[PDB]
Design an enzyme around this catalytic site. Structure first.
Site, short mmCIF file in Angstrom:
data_model
loop_
_atom_site.label_atom_id
_atom_site.label_comp_id
_atom_site.label_asym_id
_atom_site.label_seq_id
_atom_site.Cartn_x
_atom_site.Cartn_y
_atom_site.Cartn_z
N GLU A 294 0.92 -0.69 14.05
CA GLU A 294 0.11 0.01 13.07
C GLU A 294 -1.30 -0.13 13.88
OE1 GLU A 294 -0.07 -1.01 8.97
OE2 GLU A 294 2.08 -1.05 8.69
N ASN B 106 6.93 -7.36 6.95
CA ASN B 106 5.74 -6.63 7.23
C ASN B 106 4.58 -7.25 6.78
OD1 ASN B 106 4.59 -4.05 8.47
ND2 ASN B 106 3.45 -4.28 6.31
N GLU B 107 3.64 -7.91 7.53
CA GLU B 107 2.21 -8.68 7.16
C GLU B 107 2.66 -9.64 5.97
OE1 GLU B 107 -0.28 -5.48 5.98
OE2 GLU B 107 -0.30 -4.59 7.97
N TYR C 126 -6.46 -2.99 13.21
CA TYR C 126 -7.24 -1.84 12.85
C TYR C 126 -8.55 -2.39 13.09
CZ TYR C 126 -3.52 -0.09 9.89
OH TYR C 126 -2.52 0.55 9.71
N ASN D 263 -0.07 -5.29 13.65
CA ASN D 263 -0.68 -4.43 12.87
C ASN D 263 -2.21 -4.94 13.07
OD1 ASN D 263 1.73 -3.37 12.26
ND2 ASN D 263 1.58 -4.06 10.14
N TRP E 240 -0.25 4.34 12.75
CA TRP E 240 0.14 4.59 11.43
C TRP E 240 -0.74 5.53 10.91
CZ3 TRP E 240 3.57 2.62 8.20
CH2 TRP E 240 3.53 2.49 7.00
N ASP F 210 0.87 -1.27 0.12
CA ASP F 210 -0.11 0.21 -0.02
C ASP F 210 0.98 1.23 -0.11
OD1 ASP F 210 -2.40 1.52 0.07
OD2 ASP F 210 -2.41 1.78 2.12
N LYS G 223 -4.14 8.10 6.64
CA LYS G 223 -4.22 7.54 7.98
C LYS G 223 -3.31 8.52 8.77
CE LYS G 223 -5.93 2.86 7.58
NZ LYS G 223 -5.82 2.92 6.08
N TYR H 278 -11.08 -1.10 9.78
CA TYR H 278 -11.32 -2.30 9.02
C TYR H 278 -12.22 -3.52 9.62
CZ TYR H 278 -7.61 -0.69 5.80
OH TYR H 278 -6.83 0.20 4.97
#
Ligand SMILES: O=C(O)[C@H]1CNC[C@@H](O)[C@@H]1O
Ligand SMILES: O=C(O)[C@H]1CNC[C@@H](O)[C@@H]1O
Lengths: 593, 600
Positions: free
Chosen positions: B511, B416-417, B473, B471, B556, B166, B575, B477
Site C-alpha cells: 500500500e 492487514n495492519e 504513506y 503499507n 493503493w 476503512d 486513493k 499521512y
C-alpha cells in the site's frame, strides 16, 4: 410468428438452463468467418461477459467503436433427460442482426436487436453431451431496419456507425440467454383482455398451442386459490369480486394454462385492468389517470444495455421517490424483467418499438428544430423499412401484451410526418399494431416540433397525441426563455383550436444539466436552469385541459455517439448515470406528490 | 470442513441451477423473526436483487445504514431428475453471519461473509416440486469475528456499525447462489502441487472422495487431448515439454477426476489448473525459479449501486484496465473475492496475493489516521482473543481449501495492519501461520501487511513472514505537500533500519497512495490534486529503487471505493488510480510507463 415469445419457466413439463457467463468472442473485420468455418468455433477468441454490451470493456478505440461482423461462442451440457423434447435456444436479444449456429449447423436468422431470438435446435441437439452454440452478429446501421442510421466506410476499410438517433450504438448479447426444453405439444402464445362488470371482471382470453389437445385455463389469486376455470382456446374467465390492478397499487393473479391429453403447463402473473380513452381523458379502470414520469434508457456504466436486476431496483426506488407512476421504454423494447417488475410495483408503461431515426440526419436532435425536409419516406427502400417495422411491432406486442403495466404502444419517435408518403406508411403500421393487440389498447407515437399542426398528416392515426418539445432548450431558451414560453403557448393554442378532443401527453422535455455546474443567475447547462426550465414548462402544461401526462426527458444521463454537442453522452437526466439526483429532481417530487 | 469447497459444474453426474434474481427481503430490527415463523416465509417482504449489496438501493438513511438482522427468501423448482442425489444450496457468500432454512427446516449456520456457505438439503428437498429457501443474516461487527469492529446503539435504539477498517460495511447476498446435485459418492476435494524438471514438469496430486471406489486422474492440454493418466487418490502426473503457466502469458491444463466402479463412471470433476511453482529464496520472489518483481494494486469488490455484488462485467473491465497499466499482480484486499476473479486471473496470467479478512485488529473507529501514531489499544490482550483466533483460523482454512488450486494464487496474506509489538500478537499469529501451512498442499509463501506502528525496533511478528508486506504513506499521512522532501528522508530512514537488520527476505510495498479528486488541477500541486498524485508516486519510486530487497509495489488503490462516511472521506476513498466508474486519472499513465520497463 414462427416461434413462442413466452418467457421461459421451469416445471414438470418445461425446463430451462442458463448460458450466461463468459463466452468466447472474436471480431470479424475482414468478414471471412463463414468462409473459414468459424461456425464450428472461433479461431482466436477473447472472453466476453454475457449479458452485456461489449463496447465499454476495451481500452482502445478500434474495439469500442467496432462496426460490422463479430462472433460469440460458448459450450453447454445438455441433460440426457431432455431427449425427445423440443429444445430451443432463447436469446433475450441479439443486437442488431444475427445468425445462430448450433453444432456447426445454421439454425436461424433474426433482424432487430431488442426482442427475443429463438432457435429450434431439436434435431441437432445432442442430449447427454457437451453442445456448442456459435452466433454471428452484425451491428451496422441502415434505413431498411430499426433503428435507422448509416454506416460510414473509412479509407482503411473500417466501418463506423452513424446513427440517425441520439444514443450510443451498443450491441452484442445484452440480455440473458437460455436453452430450454418444451413438450412436443406446447403452449405457444396467449392473450388476455379485461372487462369490468361492477364487482366482477371478465377475462377474455385466447390460447395458441402447437397441437390439437384440449386446453384448460385456470386463474389463481395472489395466494394461489382458484377463482375461475374454463376450457378452450377461446373463452372467458369470470372473476367474482375481482381485485383490480391499480396504479402504484398492484394486484396480480396467476394464469395457468394446461394442455391435457397434462401435456404442458404455463404460468404467468397478470393483472386485471382496463385502459380506455374517453374524450381528452385517459381512463384506467374507468378513472382518469394523469401520467407522471420519465423516458428512460437501458443504460449503465460498463454494462451498456446489459440487463441487471440491480439497475432495476435502484431505478424503481428513485421513481417511487419522485412520486412518478409511469415511464416510456424509449426508444426500444426493454428486457422482459422490467415489465414484470412494473407489474408488481404498479407502474404504467408506454411500450415503444425502435422506430427512431426516420429522418435522415447524423445529428438528429438539433435537426428536429428547423423544418428541413429529408425526403425520408420517399426512398426506394421504404417497403423494406415498413416490413421490418411491422415485424418489430408484431414481436413486441406478442411479447408484452399480457403485462398489466403496458397501457399504450408507441409506434414511432420523431419521424417525418408532413407528407402523404409518411401517412400511407404509418397507416400500415397502425393497422398492423391493432391486429396484433388482443386488447386494442391506445396507440400513439412521439412527434417532434417539425410536425406542425398545420402540416402533420399522421396525428389523426393516434388515439392520444405524444409531443416532444424543447421550448427552452433547442428553441429559444436561456436569455430567450420568455419568448420560448410565448412560442410554446402559441403552438398549444393552435392545437387547442383544432378541437381534436383527444388526450395530449408530453413525452419529452428537458435540458442538458452538468452535475455541479452552478450559476447565479442561471445559465443553460447549470442545475438551476433545469429547475427554471421545468417550472416554465409546468405552467404551460397546466394551461391546457387536454394535457393528461408529462414524461420528462430523461430519467438519467446516458451514453451517446460522441460529438460537439454531447459532453460524455446526454445530460438531460434528472438523475446522474450513477443514479444520484440533481437539484431539479425534488421539483418533480414535490409537484407529483 | 464437512462440505465441498469445489466450484459447481454441469455434467452427466453433477447438476446445477442458478438461484440468482429477485428475492424477497425484510429487515428484522426487533429480532423476532424466528419466533414469528419467518423461516416458513417472510410476512411483509420487499424485492431484492441477488447477487448484490442491499445498501445502495434505498433512498433513506435508515435502510442504507441498517445494522442487525435481516432476511432473504426465494422459491425454486427442483427437477425430479435430481432424486436420489445429494442436493446442496451453495451461497458464494453470506455477509457476515447466516442461518439457512429450507422448507421450514434449519440446515446450517455460518460465520464469515466472504467464503462459500454450503447447506445439505438432501433430506428436506422435494424433487418435482417448488421448494423454499429462507436465510437469516446478520451484519454487525465485533471482536470475535472477521472483519473486526464495534456496534453502536443510537438513542432511538437503532444499531450502527462502527468498523475498525476503512471500507463500507456492505452486506447481504453479494455473490451467486446455486442449488446443485451431486452423486452419493463424489469428489469432495483435490490438491495439486508442481515440480519442474528442465523441460518437463511433475503434477503431484491428492484426491478426497466421499467413498472407497477407485479414482482415475487424467490431464488434458488446452486443446482437450490427453497428456497424462494415472489411477489412485494420490499420485503423480508426468508432463513432457510442459507448458508452464507464466506471468501475463497463461497456459491452462484441464485436470479430470473420475470415480469408477469399473463397469461405469460414478462421478467426474473437471477444472483448469496451471503448472507453476512459487518460492522464496533470499530476497527474491521466484516464479518458476525466476525472480519476479510484483507490479499492481490492492483492490476492492466495489462498484456503484452493486456494492460488492459480483458481476462478470466488472471483472472484464478491471482486467482490461490492469493489462493497460502493464500490471502483473493484485491483492484481494481485504477479503477473499468472488471465485470468478481467480478463474479469470488464471486465464489472464495475473499473480494474486489472496487475503483473509483479518483486518481491523486495532481498536479504532478512525483507523487510517490512527496508524503511524503509536497508540497501543491492547487489542490482543482482550478476553475475546481466543474466540477471534478460532474464527480467524476457520476463515483461513476455508480460503485456502477454496483457492489452493488456482495457479494465480501465489501467496496467502493472513492479516492487514494489526498490532504486532507485543508477544500477545506473536503467539496469536504463530498459530494462524501454523494452521495456514497445514491447509496448503503447496505450502506457498505466507505474509501479512504491516502498518507503520509496527516499527522495525518493536514489531514481533515479521519473523513469521516468508516475505514482508509494508503499507506506507510517506507524503500523504506523513509530511505531505510542502514537506514531501522531509517525507522522503523519513521513508529512507525507516528502510535503512530494515536494511540494517539484514533479514535477507523480500520486501513488498502493498500500500501507498494519495486521495485524488478527478479534475482537481493545480500548478504547483497541492495534496488532493491529480498532479500531486503523480509527484507522490515518483518520490516513492525513487525510494523503492534504492533498496535491492524491495521486490514488489502494489499501489493503493486500483479504484476509488466506498467507505464509512466521515470528515476525511469525500464520498469514500479516493486513493484510486481509476475512478469508481473505472476511468483513469492522470497518475494511471505514470504506472503504465514505469511498469512497462520495470522488472526482476
Ligand atoms: O435531444 C434529446 O435529448 C432528445 C430529443 N428527441 C429524441 C431523444 O432520443 C433525444 O435524446
Ligand atoms: O488509508 C488508507 O487509504 C488505507 C490505509 N491502509 C488500510 C486500507 O484499508 C486503507 O484504505
Amino acid at each position: 410468428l414462427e416461434y413462442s415469445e413466452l418467457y421461459p419457466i421451469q416445471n414438470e413439463y418445461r425446463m430451462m438452463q442458463s448460458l450466461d457467463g463468459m463466452w468466447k468472442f472474436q471480431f470479424d473485420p475482414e468478414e471471412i468467418g463463414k468462409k473459414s468455418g468459424w461456425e464450428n468455433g472461433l479461431p482466436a477468441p477473447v472472453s466476453m461477459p454475457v449479458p452485456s454490451s461489449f463496447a465499454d470493456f476495451f481500452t482502445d478505440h478500434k474495439e469500442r467503436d467496432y462496426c460490422g461482423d463479430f462472433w460469440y461462442e460458448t459450450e453447454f451440457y445438455l441433460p440426457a433427460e431432455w431427449r425427445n423434447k423440443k429444445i430451443w435456444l432463447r436469446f433475450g436479444s441479439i443486437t442488431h442482426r444475427g445468425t445462430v449456429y448450433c453444432n456447426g449447423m445454421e439454425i436461424t436468422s433474426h433482424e432487430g436487436g431488442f426482442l427475443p431470438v429463438l432457435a429450434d435446435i431439436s434435431t441437432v441437439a445432442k442430449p447427454g453431451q457437451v453442445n456448442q452454440v456459435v452466433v454471428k452478429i452484425n451491428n451496422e446501421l441502415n434505413e431498411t431496419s430499426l433503428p435507422c442510421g448509416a454506416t460510414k466506410i473509412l479509407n482503411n476499410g473500417r466501418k463506423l456507425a452513424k446513427p440517425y438517433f441520439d444514443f450510443f450504438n451498443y450491441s452484442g448479447l445484452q440480455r440473458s440467454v437460455w436453452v430450454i426444453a418444451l413438450p412436443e405439444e406446447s403452449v405457444k402464445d396467449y392473450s388476455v383482455d379485461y372487462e369490468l362488470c361492477g364487482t366482477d371482471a371478465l377475462v377474455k382470453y385466447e390460447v395458441v398451442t402447437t397441437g390439437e389437445h384440449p386446453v384448460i385455463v385456470r386463474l389463481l389469486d395472489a395466494e394461489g386459490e382458484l377463482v375461475a376455470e374454463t376450457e378452450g382456446k377461446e373463452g372467458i374467465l369470470q372473476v367474482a369480486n375481482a381485485r383490480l390492478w391499480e396504479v402504484r397499487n398492484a394486484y396480480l393473479y396467476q394464469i395457468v394454462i394446461l394442455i391435457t391429453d397434462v401435456l404442458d403447463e404455463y404460468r404467468e402473473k397478470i393483472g386485471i385492468r382496463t385502459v380506455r380513452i374517453e374524450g381528452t381523458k385517459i381512463l384506467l379502470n374507468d378513472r382518469p389517470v394523469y401520467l407522471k414520469g420519465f423516458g428512460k434508457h437501458e443504460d449503465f456504466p460498463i454494462l451498456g444495455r446489459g440487463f441487471h436486476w440491480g439497475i432495476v431496483k435502484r431505478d424503481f426506488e428513485c421513481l417511487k421517490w419522485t412520486n412518478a407512476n409511469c415511464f416510456r421504454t424509449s426508444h426500444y423494447p426493454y428486457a422482459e424483467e422490467w415489465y414484470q417488475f412494473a407489474d408488481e410495483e404498479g407502474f404504467l408503461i408506454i411500450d415503444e418499438v425502435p422506430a427512431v431515426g426516420m429522418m435522415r440526419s447524423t445529428r438528429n436532435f438539433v435537426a428536429a428544430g428547423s423544418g428541413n425536409y429529408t425526403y425520408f419516406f420517399e426512398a426506394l427502400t421504404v417497403p423494406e423499412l415498413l416490413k421490418s417495422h411491422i415485424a418489430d411491432t408484431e414481436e413486441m406486442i406478442t411479447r408484452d401484451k399480457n403485462h398489466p403495466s403496458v397501457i399504450a404502444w408507441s409506434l414511432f419517435n420523431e419521424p417525418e410526418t408532413i407528407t402523404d408518403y409518411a401517412y400511407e406508411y404509418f397507416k400500415e403500421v397502425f393497422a398492423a399494431a391493432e391486429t396484433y393487440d388482443f386488447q386494442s389498447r391506445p396507440m400513439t407515437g412521439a412527434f417532434e416540433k417539425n410536425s406542425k399542426p398545420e402540416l402533420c398528416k399522421c396525428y389523426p392515426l393516434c388515439d392520444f397525441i405524444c409531443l416532444n418539445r424543447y421550448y427552452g432548450w433547442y428553441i429559444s431558451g436561456g436569455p430567450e426563455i420568455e419568448e420560448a414560453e410565448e412560442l410554446f403557448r402559441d403552438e398549444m393554442d393552435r392545437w387547442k383550436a383544432k378541437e381534436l378532443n383527444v388526450p395530449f401527453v408530453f413525452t419529452e422535455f428537458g435540458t442538458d444539466t452538468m452535475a455541479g455546474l452552478h450559476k447565479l443567475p442561471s445559465i443553460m447547462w447549470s442545475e438551476e436552469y433545469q429547475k427554471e426550465y421545468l417550472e416554465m414548462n409546468f405552467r404551460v402544461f397546466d394551461s391546457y385541459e387536454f394535457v393528461q401526462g408529462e414524461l420528462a426527458w430523461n430519467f438519467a444521463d446516458f451514453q451517446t455517439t460522441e460529438g460537439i454537442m454531447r459532453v460524455d453522452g446526454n445530460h438531460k437526466g434528472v438523475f446522474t448515470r450513477d443514479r444520484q439526483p440533481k437539484a431539479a429532481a425534488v421539483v418533480f417530487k414535490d409537484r407529483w406528490e
